[PDB]
Symmetry: D2
Subunit: 211 residues, 4 copies
């Protein structure tokens, strides 16, 4: 819709802050000081990888006019077996993963991506984030089923105590099992829109976590 | 009105900028390099002085339930003859005035305050801003008359080429005479509300000018 | 080292957030649901009153070249017996005090201002913040002079459970006695500089609390 | 020197604005009212396409330990003949190109990418940006190799009046030939780092242009 040519602003607006519990990686690490090794988990897409390139390619290739590609097995086979070569790792994830390896934590990736016959995503993550064998676990492809949070049972089964993610379902999955859900900002150039309201559950949101 | 307990945010919103032509004092000075002395002008209230203390006192004393104090001669006599001892000079004004003195410009103050029998505001300004006799001019008390911009004729008469102010009428007074109107941000703790939309005429707005 | 004429910016900087635990008045109220009436406390200067007008006048009048006015009984007698008529109440304080009065909480003000023979600050506060007799308490002048008690000691004595303040010492006083210290932003046009780093101890900071 | 665990902030910092000449697409369009059809130009990378996915893949694949991939013809052949299928078009570019097409302007793309035997980038751009045949022009590969012309020379040759770009060199190329250089923000998740200082030459910078 049209809007004023010169909208202007004012210093109340310029200074205005949403009441969000922002945290840093250093603050998270400090909050865990002395805690022995435990399981933690990460969403993948827009949490540790900017994977829009593959999802964008998939949409254009398989369903230019809809979201049907996301239920298309042919898309998932491409997405999970090499299109992540184009996925850009997020610095926030490098920092979190390093921190959790430092702690001796077991690292899980729990994604709403659909399972495929083979997958190279686990290797991509281990390689890009320099995750040792002992801390690494194969990616859990939990899928996406409207009406159910497919991640919650996985967080319970793996006794995941902190779950990082960009989407509301990541935070509520953590809430479902009494884990600590921590929000990462989805980048504004992500093709997955609209952007979620980070902090909408009163959860911690990591500063500067869009890259 | 009520609003969500946890509203959240997103990185598009966090990065979002209004299309405003922000400038610095240094940029203004540079834009004038080589220009010989000329007349420039300043609004007073929320431009060079945070004078809300006196206006706040005036409202409480003379019309706690209305804006009638602003048409009350007894208020103006107090406001213009000592209540500016409580008015806090703005750093942006110190910087602009110093810059204009450096240039050899003639400095005018054009205020919508009502004229009084005597006034000590001119002395307050000369003293607080260290304005030499040659650059200083007595404050012009132009008053406030709905339906008229009382400042425009003054800017014309004094051949003022740049006019600084926080209010829309300051900018449009400059526009009226073809002067360069430059916006200063009104502080968010000013008692003069609502805050104006700085930049709403496509004018330059000085960064960080709320203090 | 250069402060370039055209410094530019980038979107990392534009979106950058300090890791602050921001909260709203509504969130604080929510945290207190079902809690019986209790004592709460406020610092005065830059917490509930923008009192810089009086402090500015005091400095110019009594020690233009130093900070000695703050040790000058002549200044304090003026500051505590009427110059607060020029102090601007903060909206954040209106909201907090209203919320606490509604809870049936006792309202205390604990200030580091030097004590005087008489003071009219208590009345100024009760009048401006519409504090009912049953919730109102005379201002406490805390400090390190003989016969005085510290802010910490007074918080302990009055069983103050939450203490609101803009300075580091307000937060540490609360924490020394196991009270909840909550930070209010000092306005950028305050004459008390430098501005504190709100959130420096990981405490809650109230959003938009500069006005 | 310390990066404190709890750094805090203050309202001067929160409200702080860089002195940038921000503009909107609507403001640019307004500035062109009544101007006949003309040639305009765009840089490609981080201006119209977030092409970091291909550049990221290229670096990992061809020079994981250096920047040598950018001198590797094998990389450029991949980058210019299909890896842009994974590049994410920028909304700011959709708006600008739409606006310019509506004006009947000629659309040029002038890139510093190394030239290849064949390229499919022109088609990618025409398809994604819905650029009609009459407005579309094949991508120009500019540079300093033998037989090439510089960006400046091409802007001169094609009578390009406005040039959009994210890098300093895009702005200076425009200015060297008297064209209007307008800056687009590079996304913070770009792999081309450090981010430029948008506005470093006092040029117009498009608001919200990181996506
Ligand atoms: Mg995700
Ligand atoms: Mg004014
Ligand atoms: Mg205080
Ligand atoms: Mg570029």
């Amino acid at each position: 819709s049209p809007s004023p040519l010169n909208p202007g602003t004012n210093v109340a607006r310029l200074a205005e802050q949403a009441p969000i519990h922002w945290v840093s990686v250093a603050q998270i690490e400090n909050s865990l000081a002395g805690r022995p090794p435990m399981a933690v988990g990460f969403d993948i897409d827009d949490t540790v990888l900017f994977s829009s390139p593959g999802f964008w390619r998939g949409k254009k290739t398989f369903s230019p006019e809809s979201e049907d590609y996301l239920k298309n097995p042919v898309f998932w086979e491409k997405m999970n077996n090499g299109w992540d070569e184009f996925s850009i790792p997020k610095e926030v994830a490098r920092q979190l993963i390093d921190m959790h390896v430092r702690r001796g934590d077991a690292i899980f990736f729990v994604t709403g991506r659909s399972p495929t016959k083979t997958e190279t995503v686990s290797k991509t993550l281990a390689d890009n984030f320099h995750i040792p064998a002992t801390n690494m676990n194969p990616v859990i492809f939990a899928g996406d089923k409207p009406g159910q949070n497919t991640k919650s049972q996985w967080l319970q089964d793996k006794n995941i105590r902190i779950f990082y993610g960009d989407s509301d379902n990541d935070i509520t999955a953590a809430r479902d099992v009494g884990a600590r859900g921590i929000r990462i900002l989805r980048a504004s150039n992500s093709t997955y829109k609209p952007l979620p309201q980070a902090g909408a559950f009163g959860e911690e949101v990591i500063v500067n976590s869009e890259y």
